[PDB]
């Protein structure tokens, strides 16, 4: 019917120059390029959706190749509209530069 | 080449800053970067203001430099700058931006429907005009 | 510290990949710059080094010691049977260089020319260009050929002719002919295409390409000498007789 989630990019992990804190990730939401625009997305659920080789059970559906690592936006990062996200398991490094969905679920509007 | 000038009595539109979206009059000039600025009828009290956040309009008021609020306000009210401003294409472009921004979901749906029908009618007329212009045969 | 006496370098670094040539024929690598004011002509030819001899002639060099004098000069004989034109290649200029746009081959490709397309001619079924030559007869293939020539006419900047030598006229063992793209210079693209098209299947003698007492360039592969040391390869100085592990070497 429609997209129903905001597009975001897994830009990278929270890090210094030479230290990397993989437990939290940095997301670049499309169209959000200022810190004051990020207040809408705080607390929203976010998902890293990908495919694999073996079938896994799908809630309310038949098993397929789709797998999800769930998470949520925790706070803003930087002045340019980055956000920080905590996922149930740390995001794999192959997902850098790939799609994250921000799901609008815990709505406050 | 230039047509709009910084000068006493020139009406400027504030693009950004604390007074964004308001009209002011230039009362005086300070050191090439700032201007003594006064909107008595647009709710901008007299203050310094950089030239970077100004966008000059076509209206020029006639009062001497560094006059008081009384004379600036009479110059503004006589030959009303508010209505003459709202009549311009600039002001109603701003107003159209504002009312497009404040449009709700139901309003977006209604605009989508109206624009759908409008575009279809216009496209049919364009096709008719194209076929009417395609019947040319002249050596 | 600096070397004590100055001496020029041995050998030229302009020929550094001092390796076996990847080709046996010797490719042109630069054709003469094309100017449309000239008449349509070919820019190169293929010959075979027969041998050397010498001649006697009188010199007409004023102010020289040998003016109006007899000289004996060595000459090389290059046997040049007529080339046979069997194809046309169009090239188009791109911001990545010249690229081959379209190739059109003539009907009736000679047997010695067809030998060039086979590594083992003896075992071959001789099938090369057999289906291609059929398109010079049907109406559809002829229309496609006309479209190819029109595309070359309107899109190609330089054109070249495929020409092959005639092994059957030479005393050599080899029967496999030599193919070559020879550039056609001197006109508009349409004019040189018409000229090359009328020369298809035809013979071009060497006197139609080169004239008397003009200076040309010869391109070829030199005589092989096998694996050689530095003394014979770069002509470095031989080390003294007292040298222990060998003297035909570069010391440092």
């Amino acid at each position: 019917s429609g997209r129903l989630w905001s597009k975001a990019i897994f830009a990278g992990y929270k890090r210094g120059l030479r230290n990397q804190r993989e437990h939290t990730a940095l997301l670049k939401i499309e169209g959000v390029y200022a810190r004051d625009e990020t207040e809408f997305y705080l607390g929203k659920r976010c998902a890293y959706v990908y495919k694999a080789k073996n079938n896994t059970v799908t809630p309310g559906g038949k098993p397929n190749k789709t797998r999800v690592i769930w998470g949520k936006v925790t706070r803003a990062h930087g002045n340019s509209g980055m956000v920080r996200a905590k996922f149930r398991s740390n995001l794999p490094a192959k997902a850098i530069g790939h799609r994250i969905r921000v799901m609008l679920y815990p709505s406050r509007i | 080449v230039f047509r709009r000038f910084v000068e006493v009595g020139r009406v400027a539109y504030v693009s950004f800053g604390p007074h964004a979206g308001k009209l002011v009059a230039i009362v005086d000039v300070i050191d090439q970067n700032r201007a003594l600025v006064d909107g008595p009828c647009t709710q901008v009290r007299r203050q310094a203001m950089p030239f970077k956040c100004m966008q000059l309009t076509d209206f020029i008021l006639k009062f001497p430099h560094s006059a008081h609020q009384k004379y600036v306000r009479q110059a503004w009210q006589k030959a009303d700058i508010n209505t003459k401003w709202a009549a311009t294409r600039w002001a109603k472009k701003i107003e159209a931006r504002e009312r497009k921004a404040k449009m709700t979901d139901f309003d977006r749906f209604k605009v989508m429907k109206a624009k759908k029908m409008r575009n279809r009618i216009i496209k049919n007329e364009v096709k008719k005009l194209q076929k009417a212009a395609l019947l040319k045969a002249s050596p | 510290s600096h070397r004590k006496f100055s001496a020029p370098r041995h050998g030229s670094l302009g020929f550094l990949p001092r390796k076996r040539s990847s080709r046996h024929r010797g490719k042109v690598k630069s054709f003469p710059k094309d100017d449309p004011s000239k008449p349509v002509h070919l820019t190169a030819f293929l010959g075979y080094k027969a041998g050397m001899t010498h001649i006697v002639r009188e010199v007409d060099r004023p102010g020289s010691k040998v003016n109006k004098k007899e000289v004996v000069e060595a000459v090389t004989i290059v046997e040049t049977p007529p080339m046979v034109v069997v194809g046309i290649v169009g090239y188009v200029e791109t911001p990545r260089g010249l690229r081959t746009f379209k190739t059109v081959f003539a009907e009736h490709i000679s047997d010695e020319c067809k030998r060039r397309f086979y590594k083992n001619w003896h075992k071959s079924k001789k099938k090369a260009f057999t289906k291609y030559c059929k398109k010079w007869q049907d109406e559809d293939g002829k229309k496609q050929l006309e479209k190819d020539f029109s595309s070359m006419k309107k899109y190609c900047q330089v054109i070249r002719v495929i020409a092959h030598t005639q092994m059957r006229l030479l005393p050599l063992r080899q029967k496999k002919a030599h193919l070559m793209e020879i550039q056609v210079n001197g006109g508009t693209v349409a004019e040189k295409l018409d000229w090359a098209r009328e020369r298809l299947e035809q013979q071009v003698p060497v006197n139609q390409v080169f004239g008397q007492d003009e200076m040309i360039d010869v391109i070829g592969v030199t005589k092989g000498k096998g694996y050689k040391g530095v003394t014979s390869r770069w002509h470095t100085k031989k080390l003294p007789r007292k040298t222990h592990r060998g003297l035909r070497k570069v010391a440092c």
Partner: protein, 175 residues
């Protein structure tokens, strides 16, 4: 001494009374400082230079900000100062145009830093005075004394270079 937007302070101090003078004289200075703590420190610096006073042997009886008596009027400020260069000390007279005296002194500090690389600890502001437009001496200040001043804004640089970051239309600089 660092900076910000400077403020004017009237600082009045005196020596502590002793059984040599029960009423020592009161001394007043204008200090242009970021805040009252720095203002008191600079007051002690200057009165230690001029009189034979110390922060320990004296006290500060008043330190209050001096508000501009006409912040809505453009006026010309002459500033007499001295500063240490890399190779000596020089006295300077500089002119500025501003609504506030403190703003003019801030302009002076920035301009000295820009033109002479003079840091704020090297600069000693010794006089600030509003001057008549006929008493001005700096042509960059004098050229704004036109009752019919008029100039355009010739080459207006786009400052919103990242909203949008990517666009089809190239910017216009003529307005």
């Amino acid at each position: 001494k660092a900076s910000g937007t400077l403020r004017e302070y009237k600082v009045v101090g005196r020596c502590l009374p002793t059984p040599k003078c029960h009423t020592p004289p009161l001394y007043r200075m204008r200090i242009f400082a970021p805040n009252h703590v720095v203002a008191k420190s600079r007051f002690w610096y200057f009165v230690s230079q001029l009189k034979k006073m110390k922060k320990s042997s004296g006290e500060i009886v008043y330190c209050g900000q001096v508000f501009e008596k006409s912040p809505l009027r453009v006026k010309n400020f002459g500033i007499w100062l001295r500063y240490d260069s890399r190779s000596g000390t020089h006295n300077m007279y500089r002119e500025y145009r501003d609504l506030t005296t403190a703003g003019a002194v801030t302009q002076c500090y920035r301009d000295m830093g820009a033109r002479h690389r003079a840091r704020a600890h090297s600069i000693q502001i010794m006089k600030v005075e509003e001057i008549a437009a006929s008493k001005c001496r700096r042509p960059a200040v004098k050229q704004f004394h036109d009752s019919k001043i008029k100039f355009p804004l010739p080459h207006r640089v786009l400052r919103r270079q990242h909203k949008p970051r990517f666009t089809t239309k190239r910017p216009n600089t003529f307005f």
